[PDB]
């Protein structure tokens, strides 16, 4: 499944994930693709800050949904 | 509407009305 | 533990707190660092305004997390 991760510069990163991946797993895939440490990543989806132990499906994140990446 | 929460147009975070910049990314509410 | 407070003019304040501390105690610590009376302080965390009588643990505020300070005149 592809999802998009949009940075605050408007850059759209395409990420391959599984629908059951946890947010922590997603941050690890961003680390693998972009080289950003997971502790420096904050992901926002439809108004909510995403929590590490929950799954993408828990949040209703679907194919080609966009997560917003804020660096902390 | 003045007491309503508001979504940041940059990262979508749902912010408290007392803030005029986004709590997550500091984007101003009034651009 | 350390927590951080961000002001609207961009300042970062570092506080030493315990999770059992009330929000009132946190405002008093901010006054020491800044000079703003506690009754003019509003603290926002995770989209919520924090209430004077509750504690940091009530809001699940953890080590090295950040609160936002805005002023009430
Ligand atoms: Zn934002």
From Swiss-Prot, chain B:
Query: What binding partners and quaternary form does the record give?
Result: Interacts with MAP3K7 and TRAF6. Identified in the TRIKA2 complex composed of MAP3K7, TAB1 and TAB2. Binds 'Lys-63'-linked polyubiquitin chains. Interacts with NCOR1 and HDAC3 to form a ternary complex. Interacts (via C-terminal) with NUMBL (via PTB domain). Interacts (via the C-terminus) with DYNC2I2 (via WD domains). Interacts with RBCK1. Interacts with TRIM5. Interacts with TRIM38 (via B30.2/SPRY domain), leading to its translocation to lysosomes and degradation. Interacts with ASB1; this interaction promotes TAB2 stability.
Name the consequence of residue 8 to S.
Disrupted zinc-finger; abolished methylation at C-11
Residues where (Microbial infection) S-methylcysteine is found: 11
What domain of life? Eukaryota
The zinc fingers classed as RanBP2-type run over: 1-31
Q: What does this protein do?
A: Adapter required to activate the JNK and NF-kappa-B signaling pathways through the specific recognition of 'Lys-63'-linked polyubiquitin chains by its RanBP2-type zinc finger (NZF). Acts as an adapter linking MAP3K7/TAK1 and TRAF6 to 'Lys-63'-linked polyubiquitin chains.
The observed outcome of changing residue 25 to S is: Disrupted zinc-finger; abolished methylation at C-11
Its gene name is TAB2
- Origin species, per record, is Homo sapiens (Human)
Q: What is this protein called?
A: TGF-beta-activated kinase 1 and MAP3K7-binding protein 2
Query: Which residues of the whole protein are included?
Result: 663 to 693 of 693
* Location in or out of the cell: Membrane; Endosome membrane; Lysosome membrane; Cytoplasm, Cytosol
Q: Where is this region: Interaction with polyubiquitin?
A: 13-23
**UniProt PTM comment:** Degraded in a lysosome-dependent manner following interaction with TRIM38.
Entry text on domains: The RanBP2-type zinc finger (NZF) mediates binding to two consecutive 'Lys-63'-linked ubiquitins.
Q: Which disease is it linked to?
A: Congenital heart defects, multiple types, 2: A disease characterized by congenital developmental abnormalities involving structures of the heart. CHTD2 patients have left ventricular outflow tract obstruction, subaortic stenosis, residual aortic regurgitation, atrial fibrillation, bicuspid aortic valve and aortic dilation.
Swiss-Prot record, chain C:
Q: Where in the cell is it found?
A: Cytoplasm; Nucleus; Mitochondrion outer membrane
PTM statement from Swiss-Prot or TrEMBL: Phosphorylated ubiquitin specifically binds and activates parkin (PRKN), triggering mitophagy. Phosphorylation does not affect E1-mediated E2 charging of ubiquitin but affects discharging of E2 enzymes to form polyubiquitin chains. It also affects deubiquitination by deubiquitinase enzymes such as USP30. Mono-ADP-ribosylated at the C-terminus by PARP9, a component of the PPAR9-DTX3L complex. ADP-ribosylation requires processing by E1 and E2 enzymes and prevents ubiquitin conjugation to substrates such as histones.
Membrane topology note: Peripheral membrane protein
Q: Which residues form the Ubiquitin-like domain?
A: 1-73
The chain's disulfide connectivity reads: none
**Function of the molecule:** Exists either covalently attached to another protein, or free (unanchored). When covalently bound, it is conjugated to target proteins via an isopeptide bond either as a monomer (monoubiquitin), a polymer linked via different Lys residues of the ubiquitin (polyubiquitin chains) or a linear polymer linked via the initiator Met of the ubiquitin (linear polyubiquitin chains).
Its protein name is Ubiquitin
What is the protein's species of origin?
A: Homo sapiens
Lineage summary: Eukaryota, Metazoa, Chordata, Craniata, Vertebrata
Full protein segment contained here? 77 to 149 of 229
